[PDB]
Design a protein around this ligand. Structure first.
Ligand SMILES: c1nc2c(NC3CCCCC3)nc(Nc3ccc(N4CCOCC4)cc3)nc2[nH]1
Length: 274
């Protein structure tokens, strides 16, 4: 499925931290491009240990399945290196990084119309996935990548992409799912087999809360035990600072999975906010 990239064409330059059972690097890929031109392309490299075989199989099946659905708001995966003791996803490098970090670094000096445009773009990406009956399963602001900043002179909005799904919550340890409250929905805390398209509607609500809160993490003051009580008592998140999206957040974060609205309906709701 994935184009094989040879270790000899990959240069690792900078460590960018960790994901869930991944190590992330900035690097360069040497390749033959359009018209035969030789390029040194900036890439994002995600390294999984082959020994974690269940995790690696989950991670790469998810990246493969989404890359079969080419879309302007979905990250470009170039290929994989079965680099011996490690399996490496080679991805496009996105200039401005993850959205939660971007919002923090700009001190939430971001107007509501910018947030609405990013929300709409994410909703259109999710509508495409819903129409394709593909579950992402880890929608969050860390997995929103900022390709382009707003340009006030041209009127161009920011432009985002949704990153790869990562290891499925159906195979992750339960302690990890609990830490991931309130992105993982209540039905998946009850049973990870309840993963469904409805899951992404809940997580989309949590992601909107992140966007409206300038990149704060909801329930960050709560440990895992208190995160369970949060769901037990069936609380909702507080209205974010930018409260314009509070109703849509609450409508998406519906404890009844079957009541969560379609992404088509979400897009219409976003459009109605003037
Ligand atoms: C697919 N996935 C990607 C990224 N994911 C992030 C990698 C770092 C940890 C959070 C997720 N970053 C990407 N690029 C970055 C660009 C600038 C970055 N810096 C912004 C300014 O502040 C320091 C980090 C970080 C990552 N590209 C990418 N393609």
């Amino acid at each position: 499925v994935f184009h094989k990239i040879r270790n000899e064409d990959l240069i690792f330059n900078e460590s960018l931290g960790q994901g869930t059972f991944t190590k992330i690097f900035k690097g360069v890929r040497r390749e033959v491009g359009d018209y035969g031109q030789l390029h040194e392309t900036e890439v994002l490299l995600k390294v999984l240990d082959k020994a974690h075989r269940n995790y690696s199989e989950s991670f790469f099946e998810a990246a493969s399945m989404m890359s079969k659905l080419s879309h302007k708001h979905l990250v470009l995966n170039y290929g994989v290196c079965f680099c011996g003791d490690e399996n490496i996803l080679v991805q496009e490098f996105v200039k401005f990084g993850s959205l939660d970090t971007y919002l923090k670094k700009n001190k939430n000096c971001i107007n509501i119309l910018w947030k609405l445009e990013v929300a709409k773009q994410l909703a259109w990406a999710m509508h495409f996935l819903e129409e394709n009956t593909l579950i992402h399963g880890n929608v969050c602001a860390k997995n929103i990548l900022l390709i382009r900043e707003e340009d006030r002179k041209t009127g161009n909005p920011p432009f985002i992409k949704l990153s790869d799904p990562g290891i499925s919550i159906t195979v992750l340890p339960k302690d990890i799912l609990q830490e991931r409250i309130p992105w993982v929905p209540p039905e998946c805390i009850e049973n990870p087999k309840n993963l469904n398209l409805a899951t992404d509607k809940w997580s989309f609500g949590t992601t909107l809360w992140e966007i409206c809160s300038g990149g704060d993490k909801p329930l960050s003051a709560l440990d895992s035990q208190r995160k369970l009580q949060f769901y037990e008592d069936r609380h909702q998140l507080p209205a974010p600072k930018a409260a314009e999206l509070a109703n849509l957040i609450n409508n998406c974060m519906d404890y009844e999975p079957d009541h969560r609205p379609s992404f088509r309906a979400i897009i219409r709701d976003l459009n109605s906010l003037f």
